[PDB]
Enzyme design. Structure first.
Site, PDB file in Angstrom:
ATOM      1  N   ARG C 372       0.804  -1.213   0.000  1.00  0.00           N
ATOM      2  CA  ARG C 372       0.000   0.000   0.000  1.00  0.00           C
ATOM      3  C   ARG C 372       0.840   1.267   0.000  1.00  0.00           C
ATOM      4  O   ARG C 372       0.305   2.340  -0.294  1.00  0.00           O
ATOM      5  CB  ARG C 372      -0.950  -0.008   1.197  1.00  0.00           C
TER       6      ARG C 372
HETATM    7  N1  ADP Z   1      -5.959   2.301  -9.970  1.00  0.00           N
HETATM    8  C1  ADP Z   1      -5.089   1.463  -9.364  1.00  0.00           C
HETATM    9  N2  ADP Z   1      -3.939   1.094  -9.963  1.00  0.00           N
HETATM   10  C2  ADP Z   1      -3.061   0.262  -9.377  1.00  0.00           C
HETATM   11  N3  ADP Z   1      -3.257  -0.263  -8.157  1.00  0.00           N
HETATM   12  C3  ADP Z   1      -4.367   0.023  -7.442  1.00  0.00           C
HETATM   13  C4  ADP Z   1      -5.367   0.924  -8.019  1.00  0.00           C
HETATM   14  N4  ADP Z   1      -6.352   1.034  -7.113  1.00  0.00           N
HETATM   15  C5  ADP Z   1      -6.015   0.271  -6.043  1.00  0.00           C
HETATM   16  N5  ADP Z   1      -4.830  -0.330  -6.246  1.00  0.00           N
HETATM   17  C6  ADP Z   1      -4.144  -1.238  -5.299  1.00  0.00           C
HETATM   18  O1  ADP Z   1      -5.049  -1.712  -4.301  1.00  0.00           O
HETATM   19  C7  ADP Z   1      -4.427  -1.678  -3.017  1.00  0.00           C
HETATM   20  C8  ADP Z   1      -5.451  -1.375  -1.931  1.00  0.00           C
HETATM   21  O2  ADP Z   1      -5.897  -0.032  -2.056  1.00  0.00           O
HETATM   22  P1  ADP Z   1      -6.687   0.699  -0.867  1.00  0.00           P
HETATM   23  O3  ADP Z   1      -7.992   1.234  -1.393  1.00  0.00           O
HETATM   24  O4  ADP Z   1      -5.712   1.626  -0.188  1.00  0.00           O
HETATM   25  O5  ADP Z   1      -7.033  -0.479   0.170  1.00  0.00           O
HETATM   26  P2  ADP Z   1      -8.557  -0.825   0.559  1.00  0.00           P
HETATM   27  O6  ADP Z   1      -9.216  -1.161  -0.751  1.00  0.00           O
HETATM   28  O7  ADP Z   1      -8.432  -1.985   1.511  1.00  0.00           O
HETATM   29  O8  ADP Z   1      -9.066   0.440   1.199  1.00  0.00           O
HETATM   30  C9  ADP Z   1      -3.318  -0.642  -3.108  1.00  0.00           C
HETATM   31  O9  ADP Z   1      -2.143  -1.079  -2.429  1.00  0.00           O
HETATM   32  C10 ADP Z   1      -3.042  -0.481  -4.586  1.00  0.00           C
HETATM   33  O10 ADP Z   1      -1.773  -1.038  -4.938  1.00  0.00           O
HETATM   34 MG    MG Z   2      -8.417   1.423   3.033  1.00  0.00          MG
END
Ligand code: ADP
Ligand code: MG
Ligand code: ATP
Ligand code: ATP
Ligand code: MG
Ligand code: MG
Lengths: 468, 339, 489, 52, 468
Positions: C372
């Site tokens: 992340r």
């Molecule tokens: N548009 C994107 N391009 C590349 N990776 C993405 C994208 N959206 C999300 N991710 C990946 O999904 C992971 C989780 O994102 P995040 O929203 O922070 O966690 P959660 O969905 O649990 O809240 C991130 O570490 C990221 O690498």
């Molecule tokens: Mg989150």
């Protein structure tokens, strides 16, 4: 006087009230009397908890049928103790150390409490010396460690006890040290059969047997392992002997602990197990170890309930083991003996730095082929090998031959088939599996690889069937 | 290099084994030496004097538990009312009041719904007063009726507290007549001795602690066995008999301890149970009393409990606080603190 | 020869220094006890989570504080506890000694050495339950923590102050990854620069003693034992030690973190901590929940893991990197504790037994594994060569499951990339070498070589670049980017 | 490596034997000394210098 | 008149008061932890009246160091947080204390965080679209101005990244106020969001309220209420358009469960509190736009273990106008944002609101993707070649559509090292109409991966050698 009296009796669990200042310490052995003529005996209770108001909850080593509230309970001032020395070799004892083949034998021996701490962390030294058994699958994919801890996982009736007998034959026959066998909640006739077998093979003189079997109260089934472990610990420490410790079955110790915990009023845990499951397994497994210069090679059969390998008992057992041999009902159904699942069994010493480069490479290739064959089961079970690519078809044939060749005519299997077993030196196994994984035996029929030994057996069986 | 490291580790293992063995042997020998030397009573006096000096150098501190806030307030009001009322009464009148209070407490024990109704908290008390008068306005004296009226007028956290309060008042009455007799010290000492012996004879207390058995049987047993003896003050005997009569599942010895606590409290002093392995000289007793009063400010009465296992020294305790000067505790600390 | 004088002096120190001071103390009495639990009446002034002393030098922690008594969990020995035993307050909440002396030692969750090598000189003491850095006391994670693994460093990069979860089935190579990460810090430590130095803390919970010894041996051989501290709570330990060991390690690491140092902490593993806490709660008779766990198990792990942070510059600029380990059964990440911890950490490396058996080592599951922090935890060149790589490998796996010229080209490139990331155990790769390898992969220089030889071509080539043209690496190692001149060369 | 392991085991056993002899013959030497330790511990606990 | 601590079990404290001084439910009480290391002032929210002047309360800070019998003060009111236009640009916690500047906001007007939802007569359905610029969201899950939007998903599927993207795409050009509530989330993420908002210059118009996941259950229960109180002040008093971002709302529910059993509640199914739906409904119904006053709330809903049948997300579903359901399968296939087009919905995705063309294109895309999902197993087992020609062309079209729904988000530049893109709704409708018509079948499917509009598609095609 300072004697206590029975207040509550809930199955094998007894509450005892004591005069203040005389409440026994935890794990102390207490004695009560059952006087009903048919069931007259002396109960050996074990203090499990202090309930307050000078009450102690205790686990009965014997059935409590016929016990009466208010009977006199006396405190011996010490916990359950078992005889130790070179005299315990060649005799049969119960969880309390009473000799069964010669009642009264061993009173004059030295006695050790069955409760003690494991070796201090400073004493522990990791063990990596391979223990060659002569079984192709064990030698190749999960080598055993001398002085390490080996486990045999498996559901009901997959070959755990036959494998234990095989390892006794292969390791204990020509063993210069001492052997200890602990029957923990297993078949009584199994104990009798093992006794007779050892007396016949003349290994009994070197072996001490301790039996608390199915028809015992849970306290006996959860303390017999401690008794056998106490004998093994004496041999390890006060004599510098290389001990062999066979346990069958440790899951029964955990299950007896669960029963006792239910009777003790403890809140249940996942799948109704005792809250202290991991803790108790921890003490028992940490006492079973090899210290610096002092070797115990322990082998334990671990029962897997309802063919569920995710059950908390085997799941927690998995962490205390140097080598793991997981028997599978899927393999057992094919007729492959030992019914070892090569893709789930593991050994901590199956690395190039210990087993050598070629051994590790051959084992890795065998595992890769078997994993690929497993991954194709979904396709094969519907359509068969017909839709696979030529590479996949060749790999499937090779994998079938490899998985059949991992079976072996065990010595202990003779009693079931009238066929003497075989022993394969590690170099022969490595060479044979290197040849097989290279496709040098694809022309031979699959059945030529079934329940045989080395390459000579393979050649002879292929010749008999009709191949070269 | 691995072999050399293993040799070093095995040397360290041997060293650690020797440390454990030598430490165990040394602590055992030291324990034997202290136990041998301490058999001299002069050594006992010397260690007691040293501990008393330590207490003198100790920094002074300016610092009914089961009763809740409302229950404590009600009991305080009730004892104030008893002080107001019974002060003018005589020894015979005080005895009559105590007997009537014990009888009404036993009656409350006999029937439960009446106790629940009387002890049920309520803003007003007139219905409760009318109930009490309609119940026993004839079988009790005016003073007893007024005391019970005051007791039920206020509120208590639990029903049993009510009867407890009544029991408490009864005890006070007896204690008060003891003050009229002037034998307060004798009754206090007798109560402490009875508590000690009851502690020493647990089976007797258990036989007295089974409230299921009739009260008369237990009372007669105690009278013929312990309470009734030639060298027993009549007031102490009556107090103990009344207490065992109202024993609602509490141990006899703890009840006697509570009686002694109340007896000392009504005098304003606070009891300090000092456990010693030998009897103290009068000078030692005076010094201990003075020092304990100085640290705790309020006057204190020392109760010596003989216990040879302490191997000298003293173990003072008041309330939830203990000064553990016993030599045995120091020996245990020495054994448990070694490497 | 064993110096009799030395040992005599060793015990002389204690016997001469032995002391005991009489002091007014609140009394408690053990009203009941059993199974590593006790109930103590008295101690009206006892604080919650306060240490308590039971005879024999035994220690306990007060969990449940109600009017009747205090429920206490016994740390260490418990069969000594008896009804009526005198229990003493401590006026102290759980705390442990902390200092640089703990480096290279093995200690129990109380900070007491267990390796039998002498006392540890504690700089000070630190409470186990001090709050984590606030929102305004942190700065964005920006410094890479090179694990030396191409797969992790390229697809799930870890920054200083990040919590990366190593989750998988038993025997999938979790401890291997953590130990490799700890060993890769040897070069950073030898530089002698506290800005670059990383101090490791390996916490073993409910782990067989021989396994802890073997891990210590592995660290010793590689020289990692100079800057590593082991907090050991083996299986024989009481549930109290297993519950407290991660907090002991966290406090030891926090002492360094709040002084400008960079700390890496490995919890091996949190599943056994959760089991021990469940046992403690059940024995204390607290109402259970899912899988019989207490309602605050998520709180347990979350407050433990939020203490791993990257501090701002005003606070010293220190950091603590968390590497919790989670063991799953039958590869079910839908269990209670795995779900909680996955929802806690800043990304997870999900190892699979199937991948491990296929030869994929480390068995990182690209599709469901993430970091992340992202590229912020990478040097420039690694970003350039890996940002696409990760998602392109995900696409390759999808297409391979699914099955024209474009599709076959994609399959070939994805295959070569997959065998690029296969790394042997105890074979760390410096960041510059990792950059060059991923450059070979993603820039199309492995399309000519056959798949079966990729690894070999990856190794020999790197060795060649080491012997001659070493300056290339220097560029990457110095400017932290692959210059156009360097890339062309 | 096999030869190295064998000779390591040999030196280990000889060192263990010599260390056991060393411990055995030093226990007797320190047996006389432990009396002083015990006496001094007794003196400290008692608060006075107990000679015995 | 003050109270006293009687019982302590983690975050739950029982307090005894003199009669006539028992605090009202939800009142805030103050207790003192005097221990030097952990000295603080606990805020206890009265949760239950146990009778006998005993009240059970939930501590907002850890109760470590609390002592039985310590004085407990009655504040006479609920937890009140500061409100006004001053709060904009500053970070607060669940109790209203400012973090970026302690002591700031003490002189502001304070509103109790416990409020009733708007009267049913004041409610009004919202049917105005909120164009975001994301192809999948714009086409298949249109958002509502003044409506309730949720992003469902498991752990690490892109909920927070999508929340940041919507902050970038909606809040930057927004003319009203913004309120962000970090409910039970990572402190690192909160700090990153604070820095990013300051950098974008949107902080001055935004109020941040953080109750993180290291906080006790009470803080994680009340942070959402505090942020929603600020939002309600902005809606009702200033009469301003409001953007309310909550991440993660599920934590609120989770926090309740963590304390449900300690409060003495018999657990419901799946271990959740019995009051799950009731508390969720109160909190959600407080989040709404009334007639003439608009809140465009956006919430991230964690779906435990990817299970959409779990009671928490299942209950939450009823409180949303638009739901973007992120999927683990789509995420693991490399598709970003990992939206499940077959599981997402919007109440305004009908012809009468978005027009016949948008509705037709969206429904055709859904039909194609559903058919592809149906054909996945057949393609896996019997290969694509088996399918009919219609099914083969539909599978190719569905793959291209499914990849084209992906997009390069600005917030994701930190992960893909690539700049983001924006696609006008008209362009999205045109592109997906052409895709459903098959006008891009000749293009490689990889050309549809992580791009913006049709221009990016053409450029990537020429990069891949094909021609639009
Ligand atoms: N548009 C994107 N391009 C590349 N990776 C993405 C994208 N959206 C999300 N991710 C990946 O999904 C992971 C989780 O994102 P995040 O929203 O922070 O966690 P959660 O969905 O649990 O809240 C991130 O570490 C990221 O690498
Ligand atoms: Mg989150
Ligand atoms: N090598 C073998 N050759 C032939 N038959 C075998 C072999 N191993 C096991 N069996 C068959 O399997 C049966 C079960 O074996 P075994 O008793 O060792 O299993 P187990 O796992 O210990 O069973 P249980 O759960 O009943 O204790 C044996 O009675 C025999 O019938
Ligand atoms: N990259 C690798 N290549 C080859 N072997 C490896 C690799 N990583 C780990 N192994 C080996 O795999 C086995 C399991 O490794 P490890 O002990 O780290 O796994 P684990 O998941 O932590 O196991 P456990 O469940 O026993 O704790 C060990 O033999 C280790 O040497
Ligand atoms: Mg069997
Ligand atoms: Mg491991």
């Amino acid at each position: 006087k300072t004697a206590g009296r029975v207040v509550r009796i809930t199955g094998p669990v007894v509450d005892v009230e004591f005069p203040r200042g005389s409440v026994p310490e935890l794990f102390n052995a207490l004695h009560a009397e059952i006087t009903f003529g048919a069931l007259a005996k002396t109960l050996t209770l074990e203090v499990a908890q202090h309930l307050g108001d000078s009450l102690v909850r205790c686990i009965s080593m014997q059935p409590t049928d016929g016990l009466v509230r208010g009977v006199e309970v006396t405190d011996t001032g010490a916990s359950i103790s078992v005889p130790v020395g070179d005299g315990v070799k060649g005799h049969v004892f119960n969880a309390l150390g009473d000799c069964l083949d010669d009642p009264g034998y061993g009173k004059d021996f030295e006695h050790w409490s069955i409760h003690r701490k494991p070796p201090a962390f400073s004493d522990l030294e990791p063990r990596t010396e391979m223990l060659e058994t002569g079984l192709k699958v064990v030698d190749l994919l999960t080598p055993y460690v001398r002085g390490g801890k080996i486990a045999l996982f498996g559901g009901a009736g997959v070959g755990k006890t036959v494998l234990i007998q095989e390892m006794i034959n292969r390791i204990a026959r020509n063993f210069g040290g001492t052997s200890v066998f602990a029957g923990v909640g297993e078949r009584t006739r199994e104990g009798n059969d093992l006794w007779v077998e050892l007396a016949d093979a003349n290994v009994l003189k070197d072996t001490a047997l301790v039996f608390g079997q199915m028809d015992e109260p849970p306290g006996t089934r959860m303390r017999v392992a401690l008794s056998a472990l106490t004998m093994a610990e004496f041999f390890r420490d006060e004599q510098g002997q290389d001990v062999l410790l066979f346990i069958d079955n440790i899951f029964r110790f955990t299950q007896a602990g669960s029963e006792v915990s239910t009777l003790l009023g403890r809140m249940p845990s996942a799948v109704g197990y005792q809250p202290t499951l991991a803790d108790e397994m921890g003490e028992l497994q940490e006492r079973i170890t090899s210290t610096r210069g002092r070797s115990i090679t322990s082998m334990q059969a671990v029962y897997v309930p309802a063919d569920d390998y995710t059950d908390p008992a085997p799941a927690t057992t998995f962490a205390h083991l140097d080598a793991t041999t997981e028997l599978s009902r899927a393999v057992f159904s094919k007729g492959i003996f030992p019914a070892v699942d090569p893709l789930a069994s593991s050994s901590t010493i199956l690395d190039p730095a210990i087993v050598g480069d070629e051994h590790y490479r051959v084992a890795q290739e065998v595992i890769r082929i078997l994993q690929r064959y497993k991954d194709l089961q979904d396709i094969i079970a519907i359509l068969g090998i017909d839709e696979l690519s030529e590479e996949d078809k060749q790999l499937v044939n090779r994998a079938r031959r490899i998985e059949r060749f991992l079976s072996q005519n065990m010595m202990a299997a003779e009693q079931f088939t009238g066929q003497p077993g075989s022993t394969v030196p590690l170099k022969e196994t490595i060479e044979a599996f290197d040849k097989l994984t290279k496709g040098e035996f694809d022309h031979l029929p699959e059945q030529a690889f079934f329940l045989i030994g080395g390459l000579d057996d393979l050649a002879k069986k292929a010749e008999s069937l009709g191949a070269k | 290099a691995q072999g050399a490291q293993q040799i070093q580790l095995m040397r360290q293992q041997l060293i650690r084994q020797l440390r454990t063995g030598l430490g165990a042997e040394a602590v055992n020998k030291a324990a034997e030496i202290v136990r041998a030397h301490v058999a001299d009573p002069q050594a006992q006096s010397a260690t007691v004097d040293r501990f008393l000096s330590e207490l003198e150098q100790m920094a002074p501190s300016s610092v009914t538990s089961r009763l809740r806030a409302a229950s404590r307030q009600s009991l305080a009001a009730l004892v104030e009312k008893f002080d107001s009322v019974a002060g003018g009464l005589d020894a015979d009148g005080l005895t009559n009041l105590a007997d009537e209070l014990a009888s009404v407490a036993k009656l409350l024990l006999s029937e439960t719904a009446l106790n629940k109704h009387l002890a049920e908290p309520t803003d007003d008390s007139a219905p409760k007063v009318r109930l009490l008068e309609r119940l026993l306005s004839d079988k009790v004296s005016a003073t007893t009726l007024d005391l019970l009226r005051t007791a039920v007028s206020n509120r208590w956290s639990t029903e049993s507290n009510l009867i407890d309060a009544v029991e408490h008042t009864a005890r006070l009455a007896l204690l008060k007549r003891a003050e009229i007799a002037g034998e307060v010290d004798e009754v206090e000492e007798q109560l402490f001795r009875f508590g000690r012996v009851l502690d020493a004879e647990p089976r007797l207390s258990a036989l007295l602690s089974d409230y299921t058995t009739p009260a008369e049987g237990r009372v007669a047993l105690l009278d013929k066995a312990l309470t009734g003896r030639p060298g027993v003050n009549q007031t102490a005997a009556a107090l103990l008999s009344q207490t065992v009569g109202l024993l609602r599942g509490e141990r006899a010895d703890e009840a006697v301890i509570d009686l002694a606590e109340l007896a000392v409290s009504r005098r304003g002093e606070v009891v300090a149970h000092v456990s010693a392995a030998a009897e103290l000289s009068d000078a030692q007793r005076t010094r201990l009393t003075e020092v304990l009063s100085r640290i705790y400010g309020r006057p204190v009465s020392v109760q010596l409990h003989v216990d040879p296992e302490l191997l000298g020294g003293l173990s003072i305790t008041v309330g939830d606080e203990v000064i553990d000067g016993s030599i045995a505790s120091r020996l245990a600390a020495a054994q448990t603190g070694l490497p | 020869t064993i110096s009799a004088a030395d040992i005599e002096g060793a015990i002389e120190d204690y016997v001469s220094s032995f002391s005991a001071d009489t002091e007014r103390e609140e009394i408690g009495t053990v009203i009941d006890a059993g199974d590593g639990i006790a109930h103590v009446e008295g101690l009206p002034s006892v604080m919650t989570q306060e240490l308590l002393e039971f005879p024999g030098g035994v220690l306990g922690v007060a969990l449940n504080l109600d009017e009747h008594s205090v429920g206490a969990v016994i740390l260490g020995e418990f069969e000594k506890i008896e009804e009526g035993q005198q229990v003493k307050r401590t006026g102290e909440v759980l705390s442990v000694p902390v200092g640089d002396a703990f480096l290279g030692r093995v200690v129990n969750p109380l900070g007491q050495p267990i390796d039998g090598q002498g006392d540890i000189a504690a700089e000070t003491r630190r409470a186990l339950e001090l709050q984590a850095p606030s929102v305004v006391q942190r700065q964005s994670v920006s410094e890479p923590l090179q694990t030396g693994i191409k797969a992790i460093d390229a697809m799930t990069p870890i920054g200083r102050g990040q919590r990366q979860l190593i989750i998988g089935d038993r025997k999938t190579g979790k401890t291997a990854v953590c130990v490799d990460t700890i060993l890769n810090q040897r070069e950073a430590w030898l530089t002698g620069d506290p800005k670059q130095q990383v101090r490791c803390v390996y916490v073993a919970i409910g782990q067989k003693g021989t396994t802890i010894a073997s891990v210590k041996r592995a660290l010793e051989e590689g020289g990692a034992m100079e800057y590593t501290t082991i907090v050991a709570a083996p299986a024989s330990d009481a549930a109290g030690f297993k519950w407290l060991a991660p907090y002991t390690g966290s406090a030891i690491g926090q002492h360094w973190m709040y002084n400008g140092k960079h700390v890496l902490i490995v919890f091996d593993d949190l599943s056994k901590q959760a089991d021990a806490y469940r046992a403690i709660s059940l024995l204390l008779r607290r109402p259970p929940g899912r899988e019989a766990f207490p309602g605050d198990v998520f709180y347990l792990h979350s407050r433990l893991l939020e203490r791993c942070a990257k501090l701002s510059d005003e606070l010293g600029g220190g950091s603590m990197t968390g590497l919790p380990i989670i063991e799953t059964k039958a590869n079910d990440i839908s269990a209670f504790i795995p779900t909680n911890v996955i929802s806690i950490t800043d990304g997870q490396c999900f190892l699979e037994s199937d991948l491990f058996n296929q030869g994929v080592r480390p068995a990182i599951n690209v599709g469901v594994s993430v970091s992340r922090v992202g590229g912020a935890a990478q040097i420039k060149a690694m970003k350039e060569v890996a940002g696409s790589l990760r998602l392109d490998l995900s696409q390759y796996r999808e297409l391979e499951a699914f099955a024209d010229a474009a599709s076959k080209a994609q399959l070939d490139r994805g295959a070569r990339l997959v065998e690029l990331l296969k790394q042997p155990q105890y074979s760390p790769l410096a960041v510059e070498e990792q950059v060059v390898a991923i450059f070979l992969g993603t820039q199309g220089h492995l399309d000519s070589v056959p798949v079966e030889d990729v690894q070999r071509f990856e190794s020999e080539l790197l060795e060649h670049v080491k012997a001659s043209h070493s300056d290339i690496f220097d560029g990457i190692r110095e400017t932290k980017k692959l210059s156009e001149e360097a890339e062309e060369k | 490596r096999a030869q190295a392991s064998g000779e390591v085991a040999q030196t280990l056993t000889q060192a263990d034997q010599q260390l056991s002899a060393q411990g055995d013959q030093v226990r007797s030497g320190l047996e006389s000394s432990v009396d002083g330790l015990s006496a001094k511990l007794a003196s400290r606990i008692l608060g006075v210098d107990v000679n015995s």
